[PDB]
């Protein structure tokens, strides 16, 4: 599977200059979505923050003073919404850090980030940078879409940072996101690959880099009435951590499509979109 070098080549977007640096990368990013399934940006300093987060997640996975004390089924959820907290092994381990969890929105939901406060501080930092980046990546996609295209309205409380441990050859079968957009963050190991428009595979060179990928999710495919296919991807590995931000709109908001240039408010909510 051909390797795709990105560090040195993707637009550069600086932590202290995100709004400006993303405006200046609009043209590049559009051409990526058009040329590849997906989009890419180099964010100098993101690598160090993501490696430190992931390393502290691993440590916490083996700690027993335990993450499973905050398994999804014992953490307060929101009435309507997705499910945040730790998902035990029996993606192998994995945690979902929502914006609600960061703000103790269901009071008691941020208790994992208080039990493991070093991973929590780093995960809250990574969430905030990744949400800013993903919302500006979505304004680029909206600008490639017909006039009248509404704002994506990505919700901070519904967005989740997934951090995975242990993800013997194929670690994923080909998959895409349910949600509007994903931000892939530089993983520990190489293996994540994307399908191109020609139906061939590339392996982004992203392990141990400052490169983030942005993924089209099936909600956006639906709202763009087919014009943007999901950024379908898989993971191959050779005898291990990873994290990705899944941006959702508010569950209770009405779905919408741009069909041949016309905006159509639908009956079903984005909530209903997930419940298949
Ligand atoms: N085992 C497992 N559980 C959950 N999500 C996974 C898993 N493997 C891959 N994914 C990812 C990839 C997609 O966005 C998304 C599907 O949402 P979903 O919540 O699955 O409808 O979750």
Protein residue with its CA nearest to atom 18 in ligand 1: 178
Q: How far apart are CA 180 and CA 173, in angstroms?
A: 21
* CB half-sphere exposure, 135, CA atoms < 13 A: 15
Q: How far is the CA of 82 from the centre of ligand 1 (A)?
A: 12
Ligand 1 pocket at CB < 6 A: 91, 175, 177-178
CA dist 96 and 111 (Å) reads 13
Q: Is residue 166 helix, strand or coil?
A: coil
Range of the domain at 66: 3-274
Report DSSP state, residue 236.
Answer: B
Ligand 1: distance of its center to the CA of 100 in Å?
20
Which among 164, 65, 165 is positioned nearest to 117, based on CA atoms? 65
Distance CA 73, CA 143 (A): 40
138 CA from centroid of ligand 1 (Å):
21
**Alpha carbons 161 and 49: distance in angstroms, whole number:** 14
Domain count, the chain: 1
Rounded to whole angstroms, the Cα distance separating 147 from 125 reads 34
Ligand 1 atom nearest 182 alpha carbon: 14
Sign of dihedral through CA atoms 53, 166, 170, 233?
negative
- Output the CA 91–ligand 1 centroid distance in Å: 8
Q: Ligand 1: which of 81, 216, 246, 276 to mutate, judged by most atoms within 8 Å of the beta carbon?
A: 246
Of 199, 170, 162, the C-alpha closest to 37 is: 199
Kindly report the length of the chain.
276
Experimental method: X-ray
Q: From CA 199, how far away is CA 201, in angstroms rounded?
A: 7
Structure tokens at 28: 């590049």
Q: Hey, what are 262's tokens?
A: 């016309």
Q: Domain containing 218 — which CATH number?
A: 2.60.120.330
């Amino acid at each position: 599977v051909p390797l795709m070098e990105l560090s040195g080549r993707a637009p550069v977007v600086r932590l202290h200059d995100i709004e400006a640096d993303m405006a200046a990368a609009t043209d590049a990013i559009r051409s990526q979505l058009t040329g590849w399934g997906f989009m890419a940006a180099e964010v100098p300093g993101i690598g160090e923050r993501v490696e430190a987060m992931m390393n502290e997640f691993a440590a916490a996975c083996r700690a027993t003073g335990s993450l499973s004390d905050y398994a999804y089924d014992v953490v307060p959820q929101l009435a309507v919404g997705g499910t945040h907290g730790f998902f035990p092994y029996n993606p192998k381990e994995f945690i979902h850090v929502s914006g609600a969890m960061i703000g103790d929105q269901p009071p008691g939901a941020g208790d994992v980030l208080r039990a493991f406060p070093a991973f929590g501080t780093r995960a809250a930092e990574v969430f905030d940078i990744a949400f800013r980046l993903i919302s500006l990546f979505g304004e680029v996609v909206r600008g490639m879409m017909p006039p009248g295209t509404p704002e994506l309205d990505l919700s901070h409380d519904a967005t989740n940072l997934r951090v995975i441990h242990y993800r013997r050859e194929v670690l994923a079968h080909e998959a895409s996101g349910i949600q509007m957009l994903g931000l892939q963050l530089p993983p520990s190991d190489q293996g994540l690959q994307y399908v191109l428009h020609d139906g061939t595979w590339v392996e982004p060179v992203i392990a141990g880099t400052d490169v983030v990928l942005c993924n089209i999710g099936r909600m956006l495919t639906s709202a763009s009435d087919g014009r943007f296919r999901p950024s379908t991807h898989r993971v191959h590995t050779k005898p291990r951590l990873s994290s990705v931000l899944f941006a959702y709109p508010q569950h209770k908001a009405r779905q919408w499509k741009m069909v041949d240039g016309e905006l159509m408010s639908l009956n079903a909510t984005w909530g209903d979109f997930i419940d298949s």
